[PDB]
Amino acid sequence: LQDPFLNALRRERVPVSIYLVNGIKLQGQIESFDQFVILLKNTVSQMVYKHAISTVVPSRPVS
Amino acid sequence: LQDPFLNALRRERVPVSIYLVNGIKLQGQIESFDQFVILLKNTVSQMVYKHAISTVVPSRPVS
Amino acid sequence: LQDPFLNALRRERVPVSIYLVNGIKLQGQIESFDQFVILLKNTVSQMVYKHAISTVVPSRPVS
Amino acid sequence: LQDPFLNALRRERVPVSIYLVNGIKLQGQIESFDQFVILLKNTVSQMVYKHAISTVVPSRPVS
Amino acid sequence: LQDPFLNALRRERVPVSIYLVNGIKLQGQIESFDQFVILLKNTVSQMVYKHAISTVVPSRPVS
Amino acid sequence: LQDPFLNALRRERVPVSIYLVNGIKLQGQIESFDQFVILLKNTVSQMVYKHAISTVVPSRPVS
């Protein structure tokens, strides 16, 4: 489920919110990902560990 | 235990609360799931990592 | 150790407190369990992920 | 390292503090343990998941 | 994705922020890393466990 | 990276701070370690689970 969901966000360059396990919300666009991290682009590319992610939320409906 | 419990919620489209490991409560309907994530539908589909889930709670009894 | 401890609680239908890793306390009776989840019955059955459990505490001595 | 450290506490029945990953302190005596849980005896036996333990601290020096 | 991202930061000795799963921000330069830890240099070398990292953020764009 | 870093601290008996995933700071000297725990000596030996450690920080430069 992960790969198609993440690929749709990446491909359509949709703004997303990534909530971390502490409740902090990161925003930006999904640049790339593997089974361990997601690169999230805003002003810089920041590397997010999936193990610290609770939920990924598109800013608008994404098929 | 997971798959039958989650499938019943999905199949009956019952509103559920998903509590995360930080105490945040997400609400909506179970769209689909695998061994790593749950897609939770409200206004958008958001992807929840199971490793960040503490408990899934049906809004009403579900056989 | 887990299986006998949990089975005794289930079999004797003793009220228990399940503390989560965030400090939240859930209460009810152990309905069933596997190596990943515990079903905890109060008004509904809710599915608790063991990875988010810190401690399970019987309301009274349980052999 | 775990097994000898925990066995010494168990064998000598020394009061210990078990701090959880949320900062909550549990107290009592080590009843038994495996690679997944520790049974901690105070008034009841409560089952503590090792994955939710940060540190185990003897109330006094223990060889 | 991890190794090239981390190597670029290390090689260019760029100041970074490492956010932990509790929200605490550590700052300094990436000295070295393996699949388990990152050594982060400020006044001393401190060893950060990757399992406690949520995100690594460069202070400026880094190719 | 872990073993040489931890061994240097142990061998030189340097005071260290061990920060846990909840932000609590433990202090003392590294007595011993394996892939699962670190024994941290202050007045008593306390056993710290590595999975609950975010960072280990020497009180002074340590080669």
Curated annotation (Swiss-Prot), chains A, B, C, D, E, F:
GO molecular function terms attached to this record: RNA binding
Superkingdom: Bacteria
GO terms in the biological process aspect are: regulation of DNA-templated transcription; regulation of RNA stability; regulation of translation, ncRNA-mediated
Q: Does the keyword Cell division apply?
A: no
* Keywords associated with the record: RNA-binding, Stress response
What cellular component GO annotations does this protein have?
Answer: cytosol
What region holds the Sm domain? 3-62
| Quaternary structure annotation from Swiss-Prot or TrEMBL | Homohexamer.
What is this protein for, i.e. what is its function?
Answer: RNA chaperone that binds small regulatory RNA (sRNAs) and mRNAs to facilitate mRNA translational regulation in response to envelope stress, environmental stress and changes in metabolite concentrations. Also binds with high specificity to tRNAs.
Q: Indicate the family of this protein.
A: Belongs to the Hfq family.
> What is the protein's name according to its record?
RNA-binding protein Hfq
The part of the entire sequence present here spans 7 to 69 of 102
